[PDB]
């Protein structure tokens, strides 16, 4: 799947952890901005900044779990 | 200060935390990214990617001093 695909699966997964909204607000709009760069100005640098916040959010669905077990 | 300037401030402020580098690794490479479309593309749209990048770090560092304490 596209790295467009790979960012918006992962933000959504991310979403379902009720991370805090100081954390949640930031990754939204960066997501969001990388979804207009996908849109507007397409290029294998918007690809990687993708995969990259599809690797944020994926880390951060790691984090919570791991809390969660802790707990 | 520029979104440029502002976002590898915030990231700086972020390692000293020692976030996890399951956090830390994906946000550096997201501002890699950033920074190479300020340089080569840049735009309205890169510079609020940058301010949104920013205030990520800085979200991960108000958390990060919560869990410090």
Known sequence: P??????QTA??????YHPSPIIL????????HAITLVNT????????????????????VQEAIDASILS
């Open 25 to 32: 607000k930031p990754v939204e709009q960066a997501v969001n």
């Open 2 to 7: 596209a790295p467009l695909s790979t960012m």
């Open 41 to 60: 100005s397409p290029s294998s640098v918007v690809d990687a900044l993708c995969r990259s916040l599809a690797e944020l959010c994926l880390g951060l």
């Open 11 to 16: 933000l959504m997964r991310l979403r379902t």
